[PDB]
Amino acid sequence: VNSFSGYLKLTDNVYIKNADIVEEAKKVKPTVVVNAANVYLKHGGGVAGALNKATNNAMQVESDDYIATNGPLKVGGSCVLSGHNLAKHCLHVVGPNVNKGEDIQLLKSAYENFNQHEVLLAPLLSAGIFGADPIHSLRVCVDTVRTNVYLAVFDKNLYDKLVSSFL
Numbered sequence: 001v002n003s004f005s006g007y008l009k010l011t012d013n014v015y016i017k018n019a020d021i022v023e024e025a026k027k028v029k030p031t032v033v034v035n036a037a038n039v040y041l042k043h044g045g046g047v048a049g050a051l052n053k054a055t056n057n058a059m060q061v062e063s064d065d066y067i068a069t070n071g072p073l074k075v076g077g078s079c080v081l082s083g084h085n086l087a088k089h090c091l092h093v094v095g096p097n098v099n100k101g102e103d104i105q106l107l108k109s110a111y112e113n114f115n116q117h118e119v120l121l122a123p124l125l126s127a128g129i130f131g132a133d134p135i136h137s138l139r140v141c142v143d144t145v146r147t148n149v150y151l152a153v154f155d156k157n158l159y160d161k162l163v164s165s166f167l
């Protein structure tokens with residue numbers, strides 16, 4: 001039993017909800033919140049911009065030190081950093097950005113990072129400003145992640161479309 005409330009159950013381990021991941025993280029304080037990161041950990045917009053703003057830019061400060069030491073992530077890769085005031089840890093995961101021409105076949109590799117964590121609060125990778133089809137992203141998530149994932153979907157209209165079309 002965990003503290004996540006009001007989710008629809010899609011499968012044994014995947015749950016989906018209409019919620020602002022920022023407000024959801026601040027309330028649940030989950031062990032792991034997933035960020036929709038880019039390779040440079042430049043948290044400028046989308047989910048990443050929202051999470052960073054909620055940390056009063058501390059996420060960005062930590063991220064810049066990480067990149068200065070380690071260099072950029074791989075598309076499809078991830079790193080574990082602090083969750084600041086939102087969660088114990090933030091798993092920064094790089095889904096492919098269709099608006100940059102990146103291979104959508106890397107979306108499965110991106111979701112594989114979730115399997116290193118027993119329970120996660122997460123957005124749909126590569127959705128939103130990353131330009132991929134959120135319906136497809138949900139399919140890859142369900143078919144790739146084996147650990148317990150709680151998806152927060154900000155847009156209520158998108159949430160209903162995701163549920164109504166789920167197979």
Ligand SMILES: CNC(=O)[C@@H]1CCCC[C@@H]1Nc1ncnc2[nH]c3cc(F)ccc3c12
Binds near residue numbers: 019045049050
């Ligand atoms: C990297 N991909 C994206 O940003 C996507 C673009 C639009 C479709 C959904 C998805 N974003 C989100 N998913 C869950 N919670 C969210 N809270 C937010 C607060 C904000 F200010 C901005 C965006 C989100 C957001």
